[PDB]
């Protein structure tokens, strides 16, 4: 396969990571066993073909590790994720999905299983353009629709000013998120156009690629607000 192979010692990873998360990050959820989270985890991939994958191998996970973030605190970065590092001491309230105990764990791992094997795959494993019904790409297509949904009153989206069309509908936020997001808990969409300054921007709150995305929110009857902002 193209992919990346299956992250080394990916099980103590995951949890590790959800004992931090459950003590230091988020004491509230302190009663979770992260111990039946890495189980859950590992069930659902280990020893299946790695191009099987189906949400609803996801139940069990997602149910032991759930979560709803505060209103008004669901954000998304498209296509700007690893802008998101200047705007940090913003950012301080706002959860992403990153920001998530699901989205936190299994952040920028990989995992695999193979039929017969009870062991996790270290050799690679089948990404996105290989199939799209891989382990990886389904958990964290199902953890974004899934965040969308749970998203509730004020949500925001940033994206790119420096590029032509920073509304993207085969970015994952345009073509998933922002169908997931609920008339019923939403009432608006706040989008950013984040600028570097002192350069003409490619794309406006005025342009035609966020145009696009207020029809999309309109149609739902969601209200759409876009400001733009100069980086700090």
Known sequence: WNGKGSTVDFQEIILRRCYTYIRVVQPELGDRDCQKIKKAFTDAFISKDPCSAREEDYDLLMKLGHQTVPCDKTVFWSKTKELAHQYTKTQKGLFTLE????????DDLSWCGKVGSSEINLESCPDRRNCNSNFVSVFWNLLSKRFAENACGMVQVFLNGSISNAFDKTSTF???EVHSLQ??????????????????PR???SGSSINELQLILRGKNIKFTCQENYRP
Do not use: M
């Open 174 to 176: 345009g073509r998933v």
């Open 99 to 106: 920001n998530t105990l699901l989205g936190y764990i299994a």
């Open 203 to 205: 794309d406006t709150c």
């Open 183 to 200: 008339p019923s808990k939403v009432h608006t969409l706040k989008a950013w156009v984040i600028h570097d300054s002192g350069k003409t």
